[PDB]
Every structure is written in C-alpha cells, then in structure tokens.
Amino acid sequence: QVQLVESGGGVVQPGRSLRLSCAASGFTFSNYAIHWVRQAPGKGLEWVAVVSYDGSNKYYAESVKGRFTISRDNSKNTLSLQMISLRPEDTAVYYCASVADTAMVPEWYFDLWGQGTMVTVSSASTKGPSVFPLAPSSGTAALGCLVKDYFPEPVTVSWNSGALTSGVHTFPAVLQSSGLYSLSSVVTVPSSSLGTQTYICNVNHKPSNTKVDKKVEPK
Amino acid sequence: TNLCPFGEVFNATRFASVYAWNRKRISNCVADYSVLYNSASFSTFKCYGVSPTKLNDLCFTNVYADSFVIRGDEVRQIAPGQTGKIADYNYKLPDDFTGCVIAWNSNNLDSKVGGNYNYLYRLFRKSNLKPFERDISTEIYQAGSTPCNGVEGFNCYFPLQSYGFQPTNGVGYQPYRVVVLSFELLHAPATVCGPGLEVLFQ
Amino acid sequence: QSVLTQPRSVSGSPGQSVTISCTGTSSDVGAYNYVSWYQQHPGKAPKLMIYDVSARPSGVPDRFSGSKSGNTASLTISGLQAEDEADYYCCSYAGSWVFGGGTKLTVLGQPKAAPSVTLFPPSSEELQANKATLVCLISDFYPGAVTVAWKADSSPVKAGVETTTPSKQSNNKYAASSYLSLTPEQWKSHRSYSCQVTHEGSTVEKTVAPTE
Ligand SMILES: *[C@@H]1O[C@H](CO[C@@H]2O[C@@H](C)[C@@H](O)[C@@H](O)[C@@H]2O)[C@@H](O[C@@H]2O[C@H](CO)[C@@H](O)[C@H](O)[C@H]2NC(C)=O)[C@H](O)[C@H]1NC(C)=O
C-alpha cells in the first residue's frame, strides 16, 4: 500500500507562519519528484510547488514564490512545506502528490495522492448575526429574512416559533471573502393573509449566545 | 528452441551511461530478428552490413549487444564514419561495421523534473577512440599550456559531464535508449544462428 | 495567471457519451503533449484518469479516452455510469503545471427541472444602515448546475456578487443563492436590477426596482 500522509493543518491568523509535512511509505520516495497541490474550498486545483528527486532543484508558482519553501529528507522519506506571511487567499486543502514505483506514469503527472490537510487563514472571530426582514411584495407571496455576517456556523432559523413549517426553505449560507457567513430563509404564503397573520423570524446563533426575533410585514 | 536473450538487453529496467556503455555477449542460441523488428515501435532501426529479412538465414560466431543512453540528436553519431563528442570520445563504430543500430525514445523513463544527473558522457579527450573502445578513466584534461598535476581548476577539467535530461526539452534534447547489435564472423564456429537454417536439418 | 478553459457544466444521459473540452494557449496545451485528466469525487482527492494526452493509468476503464488537437484537449467518457458523476480537471505541463477551471459532470437520473427564482430588494432597515443587499434565491432545479448573472439597467454587473455552490435539497433537486451587495446610493440611483439564472439552455430572469 503506497501511501502519502499530510499533517500540520489548522487555523492560522493572516500574516503568521505554518509548516506542513507529508510522510511517505510503500515506495522508493528518494527516487521520484513530489509536489504540493492545493484546492480552496469549493473551487479548483492549483499547483503550488515541486521538489526534484535530488532535493536541491525546487520550483514554485508565482502566487506562492517568496512565501513557501519546499524541502525533502530522503533518509527519513519525508517532505515539508514552510509557509510564511499567510494570506486568506491561501485557505485551502493541501495535497502532496507523486508517482509510485510500479506506475508507468512519469513524475510530471499526479498519480499518487494523499488525503490532504486543511489550512484556514482567517482573522475572523465569533460574530453574532444581524437579521433583516425581506418584506413581501405588493394569489401568493414570498417573505423571509436575511441573516447576515455571522461566524462561526451554524445558525438556526424558525418561523412563528415552530408554528409555521410548511413552505419554509432556509438556504445554505455563503462564505464571504470577509470570512463571515450570510444565509436567507424564505416562506411562501397566501397573499390574502398579509393583513391577518403575523410572520416572524426566530434566529439563533448558539456560538455567540444570540437569539433574535424579527417581524416581517409588507411595505 | 534455446532462443536468444534480447529481452534482457532491450527491456532492461536500467541502461548505462554512454561513456561506460554496457556490452552483453549473445552466444549459443537462435534468434528471430523479424520478431525484434516488429517487437516494438523503434524510432531508429538501421542495418549497415545487412538487412533483417536476410538475417534470419545467417550464422555468426558471436553477437554483441552494446547498450547505452544519449540525446536524440546524438543518435546520428551512432553510425560508421561519424564525428562528434559521442562518436569520437564515447562510442566509435568501425567503417567496416556489419550490424544494426536500434534506438527508441525513453523520455518517460530517464528524464526527471529538474534534470536527471545520473546519465553521463565524456566531454574531453586528448585523442579519438578506436572503434569499439571503452574509456572510463577520470583523469583531469589539460586544456591549456600549464600542466594540471591531477588538480581540477582553470583549463584543467573533469572529463565527464551530466546530461541532465528534462521533459521540458524538445525531442532532440530528450534521452534515447540505444542498442547496437554487432555480428562478428570469426574463423570459429557459429554460436548464434537465425531460424531459417533449420530446414537444412529436417 | 493562465487557466485552461473547461466548460463549467456537462450533462450526459446514462449509457451514452460526453466530451469535456479543455482549451489553452500554444505555450500550454500546444507546447507539449503533457496533458492529463483528473477525476475528483466530493470530499476526496483527485484521481489520474488520462496522461500523455491519450494514456490511461492502470485500473482506469477504456470508457475514458483522451485526445488533443491544436490548443484543445478533449476527455471523452462513453457508457456513462452513475459513479462517473464528478468534477473533472485537465492539466497541461509546459512551463508550469496549469489546471483547468473544472467541469461538473452530472449523470442525468431525473427529468429536467427548471429553476424557481425569487428576487428580494434591499430592506429599508439595511438602507438605514448605509448598506444594501439584493437576494436571488434559486430552487427546485435539476441538473444541479446554474449560472447567475446580475444586470443593472439592462447592462452587466460583476463586482459585489457572491454566489453559492448548488446544494442538494430533500426532494433531490438542487438550490443555490446569490447575494449582490451594493451601496444605498447605487441602489437608489439605477432604474432597476435583474437576476438571471441560466439552467441548461433556458434562462429565467427577475427584476426589482426601487420604491417610494
Ligand atoms: C520487451 O517487452 C515487450 C513487451 O512485452 C511485455 O514486456 C514486459 C513489460 C512484461 O511484463 C509483459 O508485460 C510483456 O511480456 C515484448 O513484446 C512482447 O513479445 C512477446 C513475444 O513475442 C509477445 O507475446 C507479447 O505480446 C509482446 N508484447 C507487446 C506489448 O508487444 C518484447 O518481446 C520484450 N523483449 C524484446 C527483446 O522485445
């Protein structure tokens, strides 16, 4: 079982330094070149850096030059990536990747992969949500609320304190570049009830001890 | 059958540097050369004395398989009467050469990201090699008027250089594996023969 | 820097074939034949499916085939099976290793469902807070791949847009949301704003205008 195992992930604050490691087993590590390739959450792959079999020839991607340093110990069969001045744009899963002895695939292709390790560069600390009423237009109507700028997850949303359930769709949140989340909850109701029934959001962000109620009315 | 061991030289996992070219001696066997022609897809298969169709009906005292690795645009030098670093200082072929030169692209196996520095060649030599000579000495080469005294430095050069094969080169600069079959026909008995000479014994 | 251009989405009926394009420059995909194709299932690492343009690594079915022409590589999957639903990425190793944007291959298992859009203007309280945000909620669509486009006064807009990646719902259809963050002034200045969601061939649009 040829295997690559990454370690050293975690959350760091923008501007600090971290050091990832990738340990190898099952093949002749010292014989092939090995790479770091990363993937930001929900996005595509990006090649980061490679080290030759010989351990002196090292190449990087411009987005990373000057900040990440790649190295390998061919006697311990390990490799390391020293990152510094870490930006939030570096938040991603870091895979190490090479080829195996049996494979007929050359080392310029990523045949053998680790399970990755996550690096989260975030200044953000616990913030309570801010709830705003998405009022109905003026058959059928749609109303809701916008839970905005909250961290961490999760946030829970109910309507009329559990009395209203049919027709409630709460949407998954968006990660804003800021580092904070924002979600929306929408309920679809008879237009003939806007005067009579009272529609009320009940938001709860437990990690910040924040329970908010926001009344949604027309106009 | 007692067939000949070509797969031991044409499919070896590792090949030699040109200056220390390897040489296996094929003997006491039968060989199908038309199988070897269509065995793989060779970039180069040039026969000088003869041709492979005719080779299946001939008998030679011994056969020699010289094997090594070089740049694509150096394979032209693995021919009789050629000149160049390789043909003059690493692997020389007689003008009266009766044999076949076979070569194929070995980029996926021998070039490495950043360079493969294990393959070597001889860069400097006072004199040309004689045909089929091998030179593995590492004596400092005097390029000036002042003697060197075995010390490397200015105009005093280590005579071997690394190929540094990379995949990002063009084909001409990529590593190619080469096998030179040379058919010796001495006064002694033919140990190696082709298959078409079994009809005379049935 | 450069990214090889793959289609964002591709849909293929089961048992049939699909082809994912991957277009680059003459200094990338045209420079050398060091083209590769990787498959990635949710939450796992990529897997090499093609190398040397057309080569298949050991243990990759011959349903996966790779070709190239000029500056464009093409991965082709025949005999589509549900397990093949995944993200696919091409890669060219010329001067550096360059990837593509990725292509979400959906293997169609339900009738096509068109998206339902609901567009909400900014709340009065938010305008009081010197902020503004338009909310475009897309629901009940399949295949799970839509493209959201914000349009001001019948003209394009691109700064301030934050869109969700489609997420499966309980009814096994997909939903996403898009938030267009604006300045109170930008909102009250223009005449209208529009959210356009493209699903398969058709596009749905909704429009909100400021009120008094
Ligand atoms: C050199 O190798 C080729 C390839 O055959 C394979 O070699 C190894 C990789 C082994 O692990 C197996 O995969 C194969 O044996 C040889 O070509 C084969 O020749 C035999 C005999 O005629 C034939 O039955 C096979 O079909 C051939 N395979 C292919 C892919 O062409 C070749 O004979 C070997 N030696 C020489 C001198 O060419």
Numbering used by the authors:
A (entry chain H): 1 to 52, 52A, 53 to 82, 82A, 82B, 82C, 83 to 100, 100A, ...
B (entry chain R): 333 to 534
C (entry chain L): 1 to 9, 11 to 27, 27A, 27B, 27C, 28 to 94, 96 to 106, 106A, ...
Sentences from the study reporting this entry:
One of these (THSC20.HVTR26) also retained activity against the Omicron variant. These two mAbs target non-overlapping epitopes on the receptor-binding domain (RBD) of the spike protein and prevent virus attachment to its host receptor, human angiotensin converting enzyme-2 (hACE2). To further examine the structural basis for the difference in epitope specificities of THSC20.HVTR04 and THSC20.HVTR26, high resolution atomic details for THSC20.HVTR04 and THSC20.HVTR26 bound to wild type SARS-CoV-2 RBD were determined by x-ray crystallography, at 2.95 Å and 1.80 Å respectively. These data confirmed non-overlapping epitopes separated by approximately 4 Å on the same protomer, with both antibodies directly occluding the ACE2 binding site.
Positions V445 and P499 of SARS-CoV-2 RBD were completely buried in THSC20.HVTR04, with additional key interactions at N439, N440, S443, K444 (including a salt bridge with CDR-H3 E100C), G446, G447, and T500. Of these, only N440K and G446S mutations are found in current SARS-CoV-2 VOI/VOCs. While N440K conferred a 25-fold reduction in THSC20.HVTR04 neutralization, the combination together with G446S and Q498R found in the Omicron variant is likely responsible for its resistant phenotype at this site. The epitope for THSC20.HVTR04 was highly similar to Imdevimab (REGEN-COV / Ronapreve) and Bebtelovimab, contacting the same positions in RBD. The ability of Bebtelovimab to neutralize Omicron may be explained by subtle differences in binding angle / CDR-H2 residues that provide enough room to accommodate the G446S substitution. Of note, the ability of THSC20.HVTR04 to potently neutralize most VOCs could be explained by the fact that these mutants do not contain mutations at amino acid positions N439, N440 and K444.
